Amino acid sequence: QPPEEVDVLVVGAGFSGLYALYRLRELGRSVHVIETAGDVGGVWYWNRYPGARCDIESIEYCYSFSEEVLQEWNWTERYASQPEILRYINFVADKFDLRSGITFHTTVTAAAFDEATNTWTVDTNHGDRIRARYLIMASGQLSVPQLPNFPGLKDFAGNLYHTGNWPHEPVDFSGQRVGVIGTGSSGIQVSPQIAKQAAELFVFQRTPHFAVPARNAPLDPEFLADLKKRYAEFREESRNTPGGTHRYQGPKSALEVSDEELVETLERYWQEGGPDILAAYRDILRDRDANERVAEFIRNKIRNTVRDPEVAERLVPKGYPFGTKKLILEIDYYEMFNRDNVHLVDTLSAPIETITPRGVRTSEREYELDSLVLATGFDALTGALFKIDIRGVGNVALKEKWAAGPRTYLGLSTAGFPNLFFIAGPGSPSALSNMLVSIEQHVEWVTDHIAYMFKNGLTRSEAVLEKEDEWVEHVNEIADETLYPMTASWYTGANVPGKPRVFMLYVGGFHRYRQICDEVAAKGYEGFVLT
Ligand SMILES: Cc1cc2nc3c(=O)[nH]c(=O)nc-3n(C[C@H](O)[C@H](O)[C@H](O)COP(=O)(O)OP(=O)(O)OC[C@H]3O[C@@H](n4cnc5c(N)ncnc54)[C@H](O)[C@@H]3O)c2cc1C
Ligand SMILES: CC(=O)c1ccc[n+]([C@@H]2O[C@H](COP(=O)([O-])OP(=O)([O-])OC[C@H]3O[C@@H](n4cnc5c(N)ncnc54)[C@H](OP(=O)([O-])[O-])[C@@H]3O)[C@@H](O)[C@H]2O)c1
Question: Measured between alpha carbons, how far is 50 from 190 in angstroms, rounded to an integer?
Answer: 6
Tell me, yes or no, whether 465 and 438 share the same domain: yes
CB atoms within 10 A of CB 105: 12
For ligand 1, atom 18, which residue shows the shortest CA distance? 435
CA atoms within 13 A on the CB side of 473: 5
Tell me, yes or no, whether 245 and 119 share the same domain: no
Query: Residue 193: exposed, middle, or buried by beta-carbon count in 10 A (0-12, 13-18, 19+)?
Result: middle
Rounded to whole angstroms, what are the CA distances from 178 to 161, 203, 337, 343?
11, 9, 15, 10
Rounded to whole angstroms, what are the CA distances from 307 to 208, 335, 338, 517?
18, 9, 6, 51
Tell me, yes or no, whether 243 and 260 share the same domain: yes
Question: Measured between alpha carbons, how far is 318 from 209 in angstroms, rounded to an integer?
Answer: 9
- Per the DSSP assignment, residues forming a β-bridge with 360 are 355, 367
Q: Which of 321, 355, 378 is the last residue of a domain?
A: 378
CATH number of the domain to which 18 belongs:
3.50.50.60
Tell me, yes or no, whether 230 and 339 share the same domain: yes
Rounded to whole angstroms, what are the CA distances from 121 to 29, 32, 109?
18, 14, 11
Residues 6+ apart with CB under 8 A from 221: 74
Question: By what technique were these coordinates determined?
Answer: X-ray
Query: Residue 271: exposed, middle, or buried by beta-carbon count in 10 A (0-12, 13-18, 19+)?
Result: exposed
Amino acid at 493: G
- Whether the CB-CB separation of 306 and 315 falls below 8 Å is answered with yes
Question: Measured between alpha carbons, how far is 180 from 182 in angstroms, rounded to an integer?
Answer: 6
Tell me, yes or no, whether 209 and 304 share the same domain: yes
- Could you tell me whether strands 200-205 and 342-346 are parallel, antiparallel, or unpaired per DSSP bridges? parallel
Tell me, yes or no, whether 368 and 395 share the same domain: no
**Rounded to the nearest 5°, which phi and psi values hold at 13?**
-120, 45
Rounded to whole angstroms, what are the CA distances from 76 to 10, 51, 53, 193, 220?
31, 16, 13, 20, 8
- Whether the CB-CB separation of 460 and 33 falls below 8 Å is answered with no
Position in ligand 2 atom list of the atom nearest CA 185: 15
Question: Measured between alpha carbons, how far is 201 from 197 in angstroms, rounded to an integer?
Answer: 9
- As for how many domains the chain has, the answer is 2
Tell me, yes or no, whether 142 and 192 share the same domain: no
Question: Measured between alpha carbons, how far is 212 from 331 in angstroms, rounded to an integer?
Answer: 9
Question: Measured between alpha carbons, how far is 450 from 528 in angstroms, rounded to an integer?
Answer: 13
- Per the DSSP assignment, residues forming a β-bridge with 329 are 212
Resolution rounded to one decimal, in angstroms: 2.7
Q: Any idea what the Cα angle at residue 262 is, between residues 300 and 293, rounded to 5°?
A: 55
Residues with CB under 6 A from ligand 1: 11-17, 34-37, 42-43, 47, 52, 54-56, 61, 107-108, 138-143, 186, 384, 388, 423-424, 431, 434-435, 439
Residue of 142, 144, 185, 438 to test ligand 2 pocket, by largest number of atoms within 8 Å of CB? 185
Question: Measured between alpha carbons, how far is 365 from 31 in angstroms, rounded to an integer?
Answer: 56
Q: Which of 351, 378, 405 is the last residue of a domain?
A: 378
Q: Which of 378, 409, 427 is the last residue of a domain?
A: 378
Measured in Å, residue 411 CA sits from the centre of ligand 2 at: 24
Measured in Å, residue 17 CA sits from the centre of ligand 1 at: 10
For ligand 1, atom 26, which residue shows the shortest CA distance? 140
Amino acid at 231: Y
Residues 6+ apart with CB under 8 A from 467: 409, 415, 527
Domain that holds residue 417: 1-148+379-531
Amino acid at 25: R
Question: Measured between alpha carbons, how far is 460 from 458 in angstroms, rounded to an integer?
Answer: 6
- Per the DSSP assignment, residues forming a β-bridge with 113 are 120
CA atoms within 13 A on the CB side of 273: 14
- Could you tell me whether strands 528-530 and 461-463 are parallel, antiparallel, or unpaired per DSSP bridges? antiparallel
CB atoms within 10 A of CB 154: 8
Find out whether the beta carbon of 149 lies less than 6 Å from any atom of ligand 2: yes
For ligand 1, atom 4, which residue shows the shortest CA distance? 54
Position in ligand 2 atom list of the atom nearest CA 494: 41
Tell me, yes or no, whether 422 and 449 share the same domain: yes
Q: Any idea what the Cα angle at residue 296 is, between residues 293 and 299, rounded to 5°?
A: 160
What is the 8-class DSSP label of residue 443? Answer: H
Residues 6+ apart with CB under 8 A from 80: 53, 54, 58, 61, 88
Tell me, yes or no, whether 129 and 255 share the same domain: no
Best CA proximity match to 422, nearest among 141, 46, 64, 74:
141
Best CA proximity match to 43, nearest among 78, 98, 82:
82
For ligand 2, atom 47, which residue shows the shortest CA distance? 326
Question: Measured between alpha carbons, how far is 395 from 391 in angstroms, rounded to an integer?
Answer: 5
How is the chain split among helix, strand and coil, in percent rounded to 5?
35, 20, 45
Rounded to whole angstroms, what are the CA distances from 100 to 39, 129, 144, 268, 443?
12, 18, 26, 49, 20
CA 201 to chain centre: 27
Tell me, yes or no, whether 529 and 475 share the same domain: yes
Measured in Å, residue 489 CA sits from the centre of ligand 2 at: 8
Tell me, yes or no, whether 350 and 276 share the same domain: yes
Tell me, yes or no, whether 349 and 208 share the same domain: yes
Measured in Å, residue 441 CA sits from the centre of ligand 1 at: 16
What is the 8-class DSSP label of residue 353? Answer: E
- Could you tell me whether strands 31-34 and 102-103 are parallel, antiparallel, or unpaired per DSSP bridges? parallel
